[PDB]
């Protein structure tokens, strides 16, 4: 949608991720693994529930109103009774149609946004030690075991700890 992460630079979703809406898969020293990210999942979920509750906020109540079905032909007054209701219905129908269209449009950009925010957050954290492969995966240029992967995920990764290792691996090489 607007940010181009979902259905954008991130090729497709993981049908296998059952524990959250956004998350990580890694492949490292000890093997490959996957983990949902619960903060962005909660951010996305809370906003959609916020939106949802506002839409289900108060059905107003109405008691005696006007007749809306007639058995005889009467002319001028019944024509108006019918016209008042038909124009009320079309206006409320327009409203409903536009409301779900704006709402849905926004829910897709909101979730696109949270995906992209998670990406940007992880980028910022890895600092000079990783490169973006451009498909939503980072190449981490230093030995990063499972506890290292867990510190990136839980947000405690210290880039300085691996900076000289990574900068060496990443740049020096032979050019």
């Amino acid at each position: 949608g607007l940010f181009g992460a979902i259905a954008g630079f991130i090729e497709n979703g993981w049908e296998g991720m059952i524990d959250g809406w956004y998350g990580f898969r890694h492949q490292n020293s000890e093997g490959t693994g996957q983990a949902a990210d619960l903060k962005s999942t909660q951010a996305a979920i809370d906003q959609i529930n916020g939106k949802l509750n506002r839409v289900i906020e108060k059905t107003n109540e109405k008691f005696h109103q006007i007749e809306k079905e007639f058995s005889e032909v009467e002319g001028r007054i019944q024509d108006l009774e019918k016209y008042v209701e038909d124009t009320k219905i079309d206006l409320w129908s327009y409203n409903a149609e536009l409301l779900v269209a704006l709402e849905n449009q926004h829910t897709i950009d909101l979730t696109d946004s949270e995906m992209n925010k998670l990406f940007e957050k992880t980028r910022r954290q890895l600092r000079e030690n990783a490169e973006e492969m451009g498909n939503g995966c980072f190449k981490i240029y230093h030995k990063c075991d499972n506890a290292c992967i867990e510190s990136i995920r839980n947000g405690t990764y210290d880039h300085d700890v691996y900076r000289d290792e990574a900068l060496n691996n990443r740049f020096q090489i032979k050019g």
């Binding site: 979902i6 049908e15 007749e67 829910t107 897709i108 995906m115 995966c137 980072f138 290792e165």
Partner: protein, 328 residues
Amino acid sequence: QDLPGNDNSTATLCLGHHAVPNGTLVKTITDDQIEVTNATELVQSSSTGKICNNPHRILDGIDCTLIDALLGDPHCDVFQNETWDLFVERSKAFSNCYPYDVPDYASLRSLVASSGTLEFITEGFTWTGVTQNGGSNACKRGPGSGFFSRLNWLTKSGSTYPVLNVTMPNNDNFDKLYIWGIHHPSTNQEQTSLYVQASGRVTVSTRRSQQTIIPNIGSRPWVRGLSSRISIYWTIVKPGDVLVINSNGNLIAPRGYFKMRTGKSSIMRSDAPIDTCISECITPNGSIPNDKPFQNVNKITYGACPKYVKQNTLKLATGMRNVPEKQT
């Protein structure tokens, strides 16, 4: 730091999002079918089929319309002094007493319907010089002739029908609804037989208003043995005002007043069954749940109900776009 930190390996971390095998199509500003992970329906489109008898007070009219219950057709005597939040009128209702017509039937049905009470107070009208309590065989009360319970048909006494001129003060602190009427005979003979004068007249007034109706002699279609008709009228008397009924023939006199109130009452035409359940929103198709914001069951509603809409389905996306990883 360490010493020559030599282990030159790398790792790969990939961010992604979920996807579901199934998925629901929703409309957007720019697309009208885009598939999302999940959605929720905002249009209620089905009724239970039954009018729940709770929380509103539903009064089933059975085979009485509200106006016949009001006038007191013998067969509707069950409803005297009854009250309701919603009076349900059934398609099977029938009248079965003296043939009558109500000039603005629609306003009287409305005005009573939202007052919500048929509480009747009898007042001591004194009709001197006329015969009271006339009835008809078209309005059988039990084995005998009868008439509407709330009306009083006056005819001559001996050889004369006087000019009646009665008055009834509204000394209470509420408005009083008086239903009265006039008898239109079929023949000039019927006119003189019953009311002596060859041309009747009824004038009902207050300090604020007056209605003078004169009868109309002529044959109408045979309805329950009769070609005569009575037409029904109403007068509201405000506190401190006074009713004066003045007639010279053909008056169908009031026996007292219905009291009026202000509330949330209304009337509904429905053949749906009343049942025991609690439901706030009533539709002539039966109750419906007001959990969704819009409904498409019926444009007639009573109670806390969703806003009626022409659409029968409107799905609100409650998840991201579905971009499946194969689809299984």
